Design a protein around this ligand. Structure first.
Ligand SMILES: O=C(O)CNC(=O)C(=O)O
Ligand SMILES: [Mg+2]
Ligand code: NI
Ligand SMILES: [Zn+2]
Length: 331
């Protein structure tokens, strides 16, 4: 068995290997990359996402979210308070202001220590889930707006034609902006490209050990667990690496820098934080190996998780027994 310790693997495809996206994901899995839940892909030196980032300031962040924490430093939840619209240029200036800017630090490990010590005492503002793309239309390799759609994959594997679309999303971050512990909708893959700015640190639990994380989360968040049998779908709970180590939960960590791709694999729980002003683009995708994970994915039916139009068909076709309860949660 390849990668039996479930380490995060880093890949350096050549320009030739960067042509066929599906083929390279299958290659990475042949080497055991999915066992970690997360992989890093460094593009060949010949590749670029677009020519420059000099003209992005007029993009609108219609609903910036202030991420307010409750709990203790290593075990907390966050809620998202809606703020007034602002442009990317306005948001960048805010991220760089004395109130929000990255503190002085020695290296990524010192910054990580400062994040876990001090995150809860601040409320950073995140531009999340903005439909759109920063890939040039002429970029033909690993262009996250030109991937094969999940609806086409389901149709190719299973024969059923379904409604829905699959488009990318932009994220504008600042110091301490935080992504809570989660797997993707329907335990899909994700791919994330860091277009510009400061790094993103990731934490990940191997898919084979995801239920260990869920059992810890039920212990640590006992009211939330009573409320919903899949409350991590709400995307609000944080648990630090120190707490994970104290409870014996297997995990790994890695820092993504600008110009790098990360892939999350089906049922790989992940969480993390941004180091400073940055912009990422991400989208979900599927492969044949996903189908069995989609059929088994948990679902939130309490009303909190509320998701895209296109998840309807995935539930309806892969999980018909759960469909009526889940749809009631959507309504
Ligand atoms: O970058 C972020 O805030 C969160 N991204 C992801 O969870 C992802 O790409 O799957
Ligand atoms: Mg612009
Ligand atoms: Ni994710
Ligand atoms: Zn729920």
């Amino acid at each position: 068995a390849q990668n039996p310790n479930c380490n995060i693997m880093i890949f350096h495809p050549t320009k030739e290997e960067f042509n066929d996206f599906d083929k390279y994901i299958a290659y990475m899995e042949s080497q055991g990359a999915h066992r970690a839940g997360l992989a890093k892909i460094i593009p060949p030196k010949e590749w670029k996402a677009r020519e420059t980032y000099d003209n992005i300031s007029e993009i609108l962040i219609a609903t910036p979210l202030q991420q307010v924490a409750s709990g203790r430093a290593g075990v907390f939840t966050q809620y998202h308070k809606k703020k007034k619209a602002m442009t990317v240029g306005e948001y960048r200036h805010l991220a760089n202001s004395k109130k929000y800017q990255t503190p002085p630090h020695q290296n990524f490990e010192d910054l990580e220590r400062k994040y876990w010590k001090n995150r809860i005492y601040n409320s950073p503002i995140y531009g999340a889930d903005i439909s759109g793309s920063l890939f040039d239309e002429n970029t033909k390799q690993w262009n996250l707006g030109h991937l094969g759609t999940i609806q086409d994959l389901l149709e190719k594997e299973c024969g059923v034609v379904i409604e829905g679309v699959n488009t990318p999303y932009l994220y504008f971050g600042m110091w301490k902006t935080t992504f809570a512990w989660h797997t993707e909708d329907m335990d899909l893959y994700s791919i994330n490209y860091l277009h510009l700015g400061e790094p993103k640190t990731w934490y990940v639990v191997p898919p084979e050990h995801g239920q260990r994380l869920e059992r810890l989360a039920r212990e640590l968040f006992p009211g939330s667990s009573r409320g919903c049998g899949a409350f991590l779908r709400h995307k609000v709970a944080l648990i630090s690496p120190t707490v994970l180590k104290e409870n014996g939960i297997p995990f790994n960590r890695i820092t993504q820098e600008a110009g790098e791709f990360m892939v999350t694999f089906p049922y790989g729980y992940h969480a993390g934080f941004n180091h400073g002003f940055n912009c990422a683009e991400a989208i979900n995708f599927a492969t044949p190996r996903w189908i069995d994970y989609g059929k088994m994915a948990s679902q939130c039916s309490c009303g909190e998780a509320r998701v895209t139009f296109s998840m309807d068909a995935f539930v309806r076709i892969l999980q018909p027994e759960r469909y009526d309860l889940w749809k009631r949660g959507q309504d």
